[PDB]
Structure formats: structure tokens, C-alpha cells
């Protein structure tokens, strides 16, 4: 099939279990099992985050960096407003808070 649909795109990588403030979190939004389509994504946690989202043969690649320790919900959702398969992942994140 030609189109792309959020139960076959999966996610993968560190940056869905988390790691420190001002660290790079770094993960993959995998198509390889949907093929293509649109993708929209939001990290919402203790903060704000910096991302760095680019397209790749992998599908998108997401890096991040978190500024305050807690955890952080990565919804992520693809061909529409609905959640892909597995989101949204908590992240959890240490060290201390820049704000």
C-alpha cells in the first residue's frame, strides 16, 4: 500500500527512556514499516525542550534537550491528530533545573 498509518510507524531510541539536563536526547520516528506520510510531534514535561527534528532515510530523526528533571511525555502523531504506535513515551531526566 501506497499510504502511510500510525499503527505501523513505531519509535525508537535513548531519547524515549531520557537522560540529563542540557544533555542531547536523541530518537527515531520510524516509517520504514508505513512507507510515507505527514508527521507532526510535541515534548511536554517539568519545561520546555529544544528540539532538532530532520527527515532521513530512518524516517524523522528527533534530538532534544531537556532543562529540568522529571519526566517528559513524547506524543507523536502521524497521517492526523492520532497518537502512533507506543506514544506517548515518558522520558525521564535527571541533574539540575535551569529554570
Same mark, same amino acid.
Given at each position: 500500500?501506497?499510504?502511510?498509518?500510525?499503527?505501523?510507524?513505531?519509535?525508537?531510541?535513548?531519547?524515549?527512556?531520557?537522560?540529563?539536563?542540557?544533555?542531547?536526547?536523541?530518537? @527515531?520516528?520510524? !516509517?520504514?514499516? &508505513?512507507?510515507?506520510?505527514? =508527521?507532526?510531534?510535541?515534548?511536554? +514535561?517539568?519545561?520546555?525542550?529544544?528540539?532538532?527534528?530532520?527527515?532521513?532515510?530512518?524516517?524523522?530523526? @528527533?534530538?532534544? !534537550?531537556?532543562? &529540568?528533571?522529571?519526566?517528559? =511525555?513524547?506524543?507523536?502523531?502521524? +497521517?492526523?491528530?492520532?497518537?502512533?504506535?507506543?506514544?506517548?513515551?515518558?522520558?525521564?531526566?535527571?541533574?539540575?533545573?535551569?529554570?
Amino acid at each position: 500500500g501506497a499510504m502511510g498509518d500510525p499503527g505501523l510507524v513505531s519509535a525508537y531510541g535513548a531519547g524515549l527512556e531520557g537522560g540529563v539536563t542540557g544533555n542531547p536526547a536523541e530518537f @527515531v520516528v520510524n !516509517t520504514s514499516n &508505513a512507507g510515507a506520510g505527514a =508527521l507532526s510531534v510535541t515534548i511536554d +514535561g517539568p519545561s520546555k525542550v529544544k528540539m532538532d527534528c530532520q527527515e532521513c532515510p530512518e524516517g524523522y530523526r @528527533v534530538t532534544y !534537550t531537556p532543562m &529540568a528533571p522529571g519526566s517528559y =511525555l513524547i506524543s507523536i502523531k502521524y +497521517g492526523g491528530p492520532y497518537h502512533i504506535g507506543g506514544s506517548p513515551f515518558k522520558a525521564k531526566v535527571t541533574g539540575p533545573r535551569l529554570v
